Amino acid sequence: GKIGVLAYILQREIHEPECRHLSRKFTEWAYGPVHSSLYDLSCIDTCEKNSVLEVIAYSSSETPNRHDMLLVEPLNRLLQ
Amino acid sequence: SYTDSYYKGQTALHIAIERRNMTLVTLLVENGADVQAAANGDFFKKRPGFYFGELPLSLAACTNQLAIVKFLLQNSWQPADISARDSVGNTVLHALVEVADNTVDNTKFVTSMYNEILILGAKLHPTLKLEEITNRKGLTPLALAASSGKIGVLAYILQREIHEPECRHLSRKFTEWAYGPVHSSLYDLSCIDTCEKNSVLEVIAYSSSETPNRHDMLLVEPLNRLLQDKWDRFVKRIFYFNFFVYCLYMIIFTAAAYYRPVEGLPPYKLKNTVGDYFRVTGEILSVSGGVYFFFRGIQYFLQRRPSLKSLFVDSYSEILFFVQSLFMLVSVVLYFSQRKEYVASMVFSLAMGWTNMLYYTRGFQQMGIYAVMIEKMILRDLCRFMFVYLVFLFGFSTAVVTLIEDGKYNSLYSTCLELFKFTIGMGDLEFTENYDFKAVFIILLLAYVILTYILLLNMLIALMGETVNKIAQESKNIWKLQRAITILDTEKSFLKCMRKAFRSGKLLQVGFTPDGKDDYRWCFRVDEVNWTT
Amino acid sequence: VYLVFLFGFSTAVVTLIEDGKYNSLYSTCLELFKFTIGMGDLEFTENYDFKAVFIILLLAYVILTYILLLNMLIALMGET
Amino acid sequence: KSLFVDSYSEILFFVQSLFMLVSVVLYFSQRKEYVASMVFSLAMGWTNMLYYTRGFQQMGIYAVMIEKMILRDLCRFMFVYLVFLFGFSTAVVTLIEDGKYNSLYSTCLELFKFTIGMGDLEFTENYDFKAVFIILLLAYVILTYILLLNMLIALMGET
Amino acid sequence: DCAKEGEVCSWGKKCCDLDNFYCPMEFIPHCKKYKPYVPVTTNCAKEGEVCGWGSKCCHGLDCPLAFIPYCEKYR
Ligand SMILES: CCCCCCCCCCCCC(=O)O[C@@H](COC(=O)CCC)COP(=O)(O)O[C@H]1[C@H](O)[C@@H](O)[C@@H](O)[C@@H](O)[C@@H]1O
Ligand SMILES: CCCCCCCCCCCCC(=O)O[C@@H](COC(=O)CCC)COP(=O)(O)O[C@H]1[C@H](O)[C@@H](O)[C@@H](O)[C@@H](O)[C@@H]1O
Ligand SMILES: CCCCCCCCCC(=O)O[C@H](COC(=O)CCCCCCC)COP(=O)(O)OCCN
Ligand SMILES: CCCCCCCCCC(=O)O[C@H](COC(=O)CCCCCCC)COP(=O)(O)OCCN
Ligand code: NA
Numbered sequence: 001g002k003i004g005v006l007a008y009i010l011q012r013e014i015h016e017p018e019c020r021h022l023s024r025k026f027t028e029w030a031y032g033p034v035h036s037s038l039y040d041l042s043c044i045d046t047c048e049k050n051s052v053l054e055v056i057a058y059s060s061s062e063t064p065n066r067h068d069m070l071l072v073e074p075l076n077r078l079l080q
Numbered sequence: 081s082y083t084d085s086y087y088k089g090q091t092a093l094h095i096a097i098e099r100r101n102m103t104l105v106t107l108l109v110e111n112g113a114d115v116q117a118a119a120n121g122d123f124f125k126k127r128p129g130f131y132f133g134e135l136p137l138s139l140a141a142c143t144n145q146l147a148i149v150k151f152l153l154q155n156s157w158q159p160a161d162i163s164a165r166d167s168v169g170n171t172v173l174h175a176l177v178e179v180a181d182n183t184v185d186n187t188k189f190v191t192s193m194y195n196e197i198l199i200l201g202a203k204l205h206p207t208l209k210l211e212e213i214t215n216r217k218g219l220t221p222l223a224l225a226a227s228s229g230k231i232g233v234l235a236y237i238l239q240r241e242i243h244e245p246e247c248r249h250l251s252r253k254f255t256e257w258a259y260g261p262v263h264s265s266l267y268d269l270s271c272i273d274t275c276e277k278n279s280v281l282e283v284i285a286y287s288s289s290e291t292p293n294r295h296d297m298l299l300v301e302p303l304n305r306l307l308q309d310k311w312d313r314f315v316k317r318i319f320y321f322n323f324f325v326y327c328l329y330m331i332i333f334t335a336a337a338y339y340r341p342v343e344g345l346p347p348y349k350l351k352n353t354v355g356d357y358f359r360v361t362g363e364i365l366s367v368s369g370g371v372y373f374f375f376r377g378i379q380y381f382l383q384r385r386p387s388l389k390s391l392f393v394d395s396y397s398e399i400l401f402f403v404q405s406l407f408m409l410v411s412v413v414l415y416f417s418q419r420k421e422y423v424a425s426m427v428f429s430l431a432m433g434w435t436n437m438l439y440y441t442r443g444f445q446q447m448g449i450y451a452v453m454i455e456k457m458i459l460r461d462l463c464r465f466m467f468v469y470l471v472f473l474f475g476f477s478t479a480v481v482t483l484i485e486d487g488k489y490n491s492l493y494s495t496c497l498e499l500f501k502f503t504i505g506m507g508d509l510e511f512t513e514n515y516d517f518k519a520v521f522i523i524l525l526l527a528y529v530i531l532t533y534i535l536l537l538n539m540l541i542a543l544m545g546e547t548v549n550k551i552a553q554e555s556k557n558i559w560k561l562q563r564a565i566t567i568l569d570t571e572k573s574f575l576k577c578m579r580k581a582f583r584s585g586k587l588l589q590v591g592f593t594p595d596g597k598d599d600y601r602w603c604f605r606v607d608e609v610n611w612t613t
Numbered sequence: 614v615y616l617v618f619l620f621g622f623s624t625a626v627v628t629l630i631e632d633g634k635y636n637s638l639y640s641t642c643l644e645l646f647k648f649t650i651g652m653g654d655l656e657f658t659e660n661y662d663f664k665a666v667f668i669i670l671l672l673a674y675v676i677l678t679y680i681l682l683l684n685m686l687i688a689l690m691g692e693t
Numbered sequence: 694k695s696l697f698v699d700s701y702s703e704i705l706f707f708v709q710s711l712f713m714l715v716s717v718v719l720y721f722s723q724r725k726e727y728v729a730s731m732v733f734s735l736a737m738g739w740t741n742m743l744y745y746t747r748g749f750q751q752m753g754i755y756a757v758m759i760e761k762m763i764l765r766d767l768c769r770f771m772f773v774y775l776v777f778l779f780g781f782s783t784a785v786v787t788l789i790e791d792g793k794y795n796s797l798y799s800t801c802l803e804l805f806k807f808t809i810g811m812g813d814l815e816f817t818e819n820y821d822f823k824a825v826f827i828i829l830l831l832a833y834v835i836l837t838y839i840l841l842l843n844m845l846i847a848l849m850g851e852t
Numbered sequence: 853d854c855a856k857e858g859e860v861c862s863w864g865k866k867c868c869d870l871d872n873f874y875c876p877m878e879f880i881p882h883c884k885k886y887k888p889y890v891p892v893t894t895n896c897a898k899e900g901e902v903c904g905w906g907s908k909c910c911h912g913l914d915c916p917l918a919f920i921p922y923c924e925k926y927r
């Protein structure tokens with residue numbers, strides 16, 4: 001339930017040489033006032049061992065922020 | 081130029097403006113590029129995309145590239161046409177209004193760009209009525225802004241001031257005179273009430289209710305005072321007169337219905353006596369009102385044509401009055417058909433005929449807010465509560481009837497009534513009858529009562545979360561909108577050589593147009609006091 | 614508001630049923646008022662000509678008066 | 694521990710199915726009491742319709758409020774009220790041992806009726822300890838309404 | 853005039869023979885006869901047997917109020 005680290009990890013972005021492959025948030029294209037980003041959702045939907053949606057949804061209810069973790073940027077639109 | 085349908089019409093000028101690079105724009109214009117080229121691809125239409133008006137001039141305007149806008153209109157090689165039109169029918173001002181979203185920074189940008197473009201256009205083409213060019217739908221930029229809910233743009237347009245020589249005529253807010261702490265401003269309200277195409281009051285009042293700021297757009301400075309001036313001038317007396325007449329109609333109807341004859345088999349012969357003459361007079365005066373409401377309720381629909389969705393969202397009272405008139409007509413038909421059931425219809429048209437008197441609470445603020453609150457809570461929360469409660473009640477009624485099939489519980493209707501009585505608080509927890517499944521029936525009734533009280537308590541608590549600075553503020557704007565709608569409805573017909581709806585008169589505002597002619601603007605006077613001077 | 618509503622429904626009830634405690638406006642007004650304080654008489658033991666219309670009128674009256682009372686209560690919360 | 698605090702709808706659907714199966718067993722065993730099971734399976738079978746309020750934005754929050762206030766707040770008032778009711782019921786049964794109060798079950802039901810506004814303060818019967826009975830009933834009624842009002846305001850403290 | 857057997861009562865007219873017919877509560881009532889007062893003698897519980905849970909006490913007995921009641925002779 002450490003949402004502070006989850007929110008960082010799911011939206012990680014870096015624009016350094018030999019480090020761009022570590023990012024999960026990228027940009028596909030842009031226009032003047034509008035742009036289109038794309039998030040890497042690897043290991044969120046399917047892992048076969050332990051995915052983010054499964055580990056959040058099926059938690060023991062002892063987790064403090066199990067209600068708030070689903071409000072992070074990619075999951076809120078992925079579920080919708 | 082791109083030929084693919086996705087990027088159809090895109091050329092180098094659009095990319096140059098996109099890149100915010102003046103050098104390529106200058107080079108393209110120098111080489112004879114067509115400044116009027118239209119980007120007609122699906123990517124640029126009003127799904128993914130970005131609509132800007134399809135033209136480089138409106139693209140520069142929409143991207144806050146003021147230098148490109150100035151260059152394009154005034155370069156020697158090929159200046160752009162400020163009055164150009166897109167495929168939809170919009171021009172630069174319409175596209176600039178369209179990109180507004182009522183945010184602070186975007187509103188500032190749109191207002192500044194709009195003012196600068198208007199001033200430059202007036203300077204280049206003094207004889208061009210740039211603001212009065214309608215699009216395909218027939219809307220001017222002011223009408224479009226009012227229709228789409230662009231409150232930030234409307235609030236600027238209605239009260240703009242331009243203090244520059246040869247540009248003062250573009251403004252519509254002026255000063256008539258000044259003293260020390262007190263002065264008098266003068267607003268030009270052309271095309272606010274009467275224009276014969278689509279006025280601001282008409283477009284705000286009779287919109288589809290999809291606009292998110294429909295209630296806020298009447299809070300601007302000129303419109304609120306205009307509506308209050310209209311109410312206090314002639315409309316108030318008309319409304320009170322109509323209320324008085326309706327009260328007389330209901331008194332006559334009630335008196336005529338109360339003293340109906342008790343014999344069967346209508347119609348009844350008229351006796352040659354005074355009381356029966358008064359009675360039949362009352363009956364005739366009761367039927368005529370139903371005919372009147374029937375025709376008025378048709379005329380409402382024909383002059384609006386709602387698309388079967390807003391009927392139960394706005395103008396509910398039209399439906400209620402129409403239903404009253406329908407019941408009256410059915411009563412007449414049953415009366416002359418020699419049926420006794422006409423009374424069953426008549427009392428219904430009586431019973432709701434009093435409740436529709438709440439329609440006349442408007443005009444009295446202290447009762448209008450209360451009525452708006454009643455309508456808000458009924459249409460919002462009690463529908464959900466009634467849905468859940470009715471399903472629950474049906475379930476327990478079919479449970480009870482299956483267990484006890486005699487003794488007030490041999491039908492679904494009687495069981496439903498007997499269970500509903502508990503909600504009021506008039507139950508029959510006696511258990512004196514010798515049922516086959518006693519001591520199970522008790523458990524069902526206790527569970528039903530507990531669950532129903534839990535539901536009622538939940539409803540009550542849920543209604544408390546809407547009292548925290550939510551209902552109190554909203555109801556006032558809704559009431560003001562209702563008063564505006566009835567004022568417009570009264571002003572619209574009036575059929576008596578309208579004079580009293582007019583503003584201060586043909587006052588000379590500037591008297592010096594770009595040509596030698598003068599001007600008269602049909603203004604509205606608003607006094608003000610300010611001690612910071 | 615309540616008195617006007619009560620007068621309207623009382624006149625409707627007196628018009629529909631001209632006997633059995635509903636042959637006058639005063640008695641009908643008292644009988645309808647008693648519902649507001651939880652002392653109703655929804656028994657329907659008498660053989661009226663227009664029963665099953667009378668029931669609908671009484672149900673509508675009760676529901677509308679409880680809506681009005683709930684609205685009054687909620688509106689009073691704007692003062693605190 | 695997880696079942697008692699989460700995944701209630703699965704438990705309710707399972708209990709519905711259990712009632713249905715017991716109804717079947719009683720049916721084929723030549724018992725009439727199968728009806729008593731079947732009706733229960735029906736009565737809650739409609740209530741579980743609330744499960745399908747999710748997916749709908751407006752109704753789901755209303756249902757969540759109902760379930761949360763049932764599990765959180767009312768389960769304490771239930772305990773307090775039931776202990777109070779048991780105490781006063783035993784006192785009344787001790788004082789008046791004949792006629793509608795000779796049993797604890799009937800006395801509990803008769804005292805419960807006051808909570809829902811259908812009491813009986815006629816005092817027609819000639820009891821031996823009348824005018825003590827009146828004081829007990831008045832005290833019970835007043836304390837009950839104080840408890841209910843306090844519950845209601847405490848629930849205003851959560852909005 | 854008044855309604856007869858099988859006719860729709862309470863929608864503008866009552867039934868006359870109240871000593872033999874009654875107008876029920878079904879939202880479209882039809883006047884029907886009273887059933888005979890037949891006593892219960894079979895498929896009923898005897899004194900000392902369990903009451904309430906699926907079987908009524910016979911006509912000569914009464915059922916007390918309890919979770920598991922037993923038929924008793926009324927006084
Ligand atoms: C025998 C059985 C009787 C049953 C009678 C039931 C109570 C009658 C009460 C009569 C009150 C008359 C009235 O004043 O009508 C009420 C309707 O009350 C109801 O909810 C009826 C539910 C059905 C308000 O309707 P209105 O036309 O004002 O619509 C509003 C606009 O004016 C405004 O511009 C806004 O757009 C706003 O969002 C709109 O809502
Ligand atoms: C004949 C006598 C009938 C008796 C019937 C008694 C009322 C029935 C009410 C029917 C409602 C059905 C339902 O929908 O059940 C409800 C729970 O309400 C109750 O049953 C109250 C019982 C006290 C939803 O519980 P849910 O499975 O969604 O678990 C939730 C999680 O999902 C969520 O993420 C959260 O962790 C949350 O804290 C969890 O709860
Ligand atoms: C608001 C609390 C009190 C509610 C009281 C009504 C209980 C629901 C009634 C019922 O569902 O019963 C139906 C009759 O439906 C109707 O009359 C129309 C009712 C439509 C639903 C209105 C919901 C408010 C079957 O009964 P019949 O009249 O057809 O039987 C005669 C011939 N054997
Ligand atoms: C909410 C108001 C009504 C409350 C009523 C409860 C009074 C419980 C008092 C009693 O102890 O009653 C006994 C046992 O109780 C029970 O059944 C189960 C009680 C379970 C608690 C329920 C919590 C609401 C019944 O046994 P009998 O008296 O029928 O004896 C038969 C002789 N062979
Ligand atoms: Na009460």
Ligand code: NA
Pocket residue numbers: 505506651652810811
């Ligand atoms: Na009561």
